[PDB]
Amino acid sequence: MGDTRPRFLWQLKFECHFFNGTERVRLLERCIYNQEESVRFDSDVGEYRAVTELGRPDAEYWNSQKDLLEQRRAAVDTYCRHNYGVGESFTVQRRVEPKVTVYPSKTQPLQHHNLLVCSVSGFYPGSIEVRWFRNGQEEKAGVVSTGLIQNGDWTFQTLVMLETVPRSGEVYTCQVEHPSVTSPLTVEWRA
Amino acid sequence: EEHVIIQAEFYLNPDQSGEFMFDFDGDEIFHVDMAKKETVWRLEEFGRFASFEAQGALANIAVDKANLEIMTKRSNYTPITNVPPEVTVLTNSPVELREPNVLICFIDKFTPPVVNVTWLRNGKPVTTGVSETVFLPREDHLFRKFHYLPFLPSTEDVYDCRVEHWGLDEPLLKQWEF
């Protein structure tokens, strides 16, 4: 791309953090110039505070306005709790079950070794636990997890591989625990 | 922390680009199309469950625009430092030959929020059935973005997610193949 003219960015963010449903709610308003956060309003503080010298003028001017300070102090209820309730049913309560498959990697670099792959996809929320077992005994070594991947479409995926040296008769099991299911999902691969 | 809802906005000059969006635990609920002056729901069902008056978003953007210019001068006209994106390409499910799938290009940790993304199949651009998200917020104040390409797996096809950003000296190409 061309156009190397200097760019100037300004961000305004209002973060509503919820703990135990809505028993504890905190509003964190933050202003960011380019990459530097310059001023904020933390509900736990009650007033605007300058993060860098750049925001001092805004904190002062904004804190001078009493009606603004009051609506902001009640935002935790009129804004945060309000919006949390608007989508509670299709966000906080959203539950999509993972699709689990186990297969040997299509690329095996070592003879006598078998890199096994447990693919876990299309799930929500992101909170999940994936474990490998050999003959019903948890494998805590030789496990490689790609980590949690947020797909951007209200769905998640994760890949967990197991380094193995298979002996005939062995049973390998990938076990997935997620809020969408009551008992663990298991998928096995037999040596 | 059980959950976080974020109303995130930005205005960028000289591009004169603005954005207004809400997200829940990192996933976008909706954003406002500034041009069509309308709320765009990330998942269609959300718009049958809730509403949002787009006009109010425009109001905020106007204020963000005026504050950016104020802040531009107050900083002695200090420009943003370009941070190039980290790019990865994955499918959303394990691939099976001749079984419909979707390629996802994850563009992450970059700023400013301007980028050029193109899907290439065997070197030529593909636009069929493709989609993308707007710029999503990050705790470090950089941005995330996703592009999608439905496809039919082949042993013969090679794909690239071509990404250009001011922080890069040349196009970044991340390929994927069956």
Partner: peptide, 15 residues
């Protein structure tokens, strides 16, 4: 009238 998401209004800065 489906439940509406409510925004927090951007405040105008001083010079």
């Amino acid at each position: 009238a489906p439940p509406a998401y409510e925004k927090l209004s951007a405040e105008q800065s001083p010079p």
